């Protein structure tokens, strides 16, 4: 009696009465998401119904993981958990999980191709980095940052949408079969910043192989040291491409593309868009760069941080919901 049902295409959203005005804004293999209005908090929310969370151990494992990280991770620059519920009254009946988040106005896809001043550019990038740093502190490395999984509001605030693991924003480590570390996420920040400046995708590969070619065409073929780190099968392709010199960052990002500040942005870009991760800038150095550091606030940029059966996952998830 505290709940009601709304049909959402072929899916039924059975939710607390506080949530009205439901409307589907997205879906994927793991869930359906509706925009809604929360009559109790008097604010807009996003409600995600998880998809087939108990179909197998793998689905259950992810559902449990997603739920635990959203609860335990807290930072203004990371999508937060407002509420979690199940419409079922018992563990025996337990089937469905709904996650409630603050409703953001947009992702970054269009915004970054509009023309932003330095202040907006750098402030958005500062917030991204603060968000990413907090993920890394919690032992979460994203590996898949892109504009579509970064959300904003009309008040110029920003949150990262998910905890990760379109190929334009993938680092070289990922493109190829390499090991990664923290600064894998810096590449994606680089691609995004560049795009804010350029007004279009930096490295728009037509396929997974072409993504590499687009990068090296602009940045240059990486040195032999790096080639040695590649697995034999991928090394055979990569090493035998024509040799590109790359263009300087002055040529890639000349003054005329921008709205000292351009010089500072270029310098930072030249340190993030580095193919060889062992030569790429880190998150901490990025936050300390004069282009980003102007917004510095320690409370934001230094914030304090197996095997089961389906029924055991059901129970672990149920406890987490209650």
């Amino acid at each position: 009696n505290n709940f009601y049902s709304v049909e959402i295409g072929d899916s039924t959203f059975t939710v607390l009465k506080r949530y009205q005005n439901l409307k589907p804004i997205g879906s994927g293999a793991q869930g359906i998401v509706c925009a809604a209005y929360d009559a109790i908090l008097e604010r807009n929310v996003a409600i995600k119904k998880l998809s087939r969370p108990f179909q197998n151990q793998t689905h259950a494992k992810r559902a449990y993981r997603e739920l635990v990280l959203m609860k335990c991770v807290n930072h203004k620059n990371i999508i937060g958990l407002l509420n979690v519920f199940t419409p079922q009254k018992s563990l025996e009946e337990f089937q469905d999980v709904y996650i409630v988040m603050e409703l953001m106005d947009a992702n970054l896809c269009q915004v970054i191709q509009m023309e932003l001043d330095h202040e907006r550019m750098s402030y958005l990038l500062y917030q991204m980095l603060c968000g990413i740093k907090h993920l890394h502190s919690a032992g979460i490395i994203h590996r898949d940052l892109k504009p579509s999984n970064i959300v904003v509001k009309s008040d110029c605030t920003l949150k990262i949408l998910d905890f990760g693991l379109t190929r334009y924003y993938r680092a070289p480590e990922v493109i190829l079969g390499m090991g990664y570390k923290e600064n894998v996420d810096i590449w994606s920040v680089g691609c995004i910043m560049g795009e804010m400046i350029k007004g279009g995708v930096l490295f728009p590969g037509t396929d997974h192989i072409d993504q590499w070619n687009k990068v090296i065409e602009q940045l240059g073929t990486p040195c032999p040291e790096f080639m040695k780190k590649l697995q034999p099968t991928v090394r055979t392709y990569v090493e035998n491409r024509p040799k590109y010199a790359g263009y300087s960052f002055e040529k890639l990002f000349p003054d005329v593309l921008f709205p000292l500040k351009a010089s500072q942005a270029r310098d930072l870009l030249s340190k993030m868009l580095v193919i060889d991760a062992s030569k790429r800038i880190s998150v901490d150095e990025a936050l300390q760069h004069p282009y980003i550091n102007v917004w510095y606030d320690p409370s934001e940029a230094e914030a304090p941080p197996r095997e089961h059966t389906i029924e055991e996952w059901k129970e672990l998830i149920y406890k987490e919901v209650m």
Partner: peptide, 9 residues
């Protein structure tokens, strides 16, 4: 330097 408080969608 004051933080932007608006963003055009």
């Amino acid at each position: 330097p004051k933080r932007p408080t608006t963003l055009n969608l």
